[PDB]
Structure 1
Amino acid sequence: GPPSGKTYMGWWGHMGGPKQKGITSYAVSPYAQKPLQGIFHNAVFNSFRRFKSQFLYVLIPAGIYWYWWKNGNEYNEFLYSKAGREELERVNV
Structure 2
Amino acid sequence: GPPSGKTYMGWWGHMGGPKQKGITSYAVSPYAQKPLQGIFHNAVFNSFRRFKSQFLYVLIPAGIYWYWWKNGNEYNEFLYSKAGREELERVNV
Alignment TM-score > 0.5, same fold: yes
Q: TM-score, normalised by structure 1?
A: 0.83
Structure 2: stretches of 5+ with no match in the other structure: none
Please give the alpha-carbon distance, in whole angstroms, between the structure 2 residues aligned to 1:4 and 1:25: 33
Q: How many residues align?
A: 93
CA deviation after TM superposition for structure 1 residue 35, in Å: 4.3
User: Going by fraction, where is helix more abundant, 1 or 2?
Assistant: 2
Moved more, 73-82 or 56-65: 73-82
Percent identity of equivalent pairs: 100
CA deviation after TM superposition for structure 1 residue 85, in Å: 3.1
Please give the alpha-carbon distance, in whole angstroms, between the structure 2 residues aligned to 1:80 and 1:45: 49
Q: TM-score, normalised by structure 2?
A: 0.83
With over 3 angstroms needed to count, the CA separation of the structure-2 counterparts of 1:2 and 1:34, relative to structure 1, is closer
With over 3 angstroms needed to count, the CA separation of the structure-2 counterparts of 1:57 and 1:42, relative to structure 1, is same
CA deviation after TM superposition for structure 1 residue 36, in Å: 3.1
Moved more, 21-30 or 37-46: 37-46
- Structure 1, residues 26-83: CA drift from partner, whole Å, max 9, x if none? 1101100114335122222222111221131121111111100011112222212224
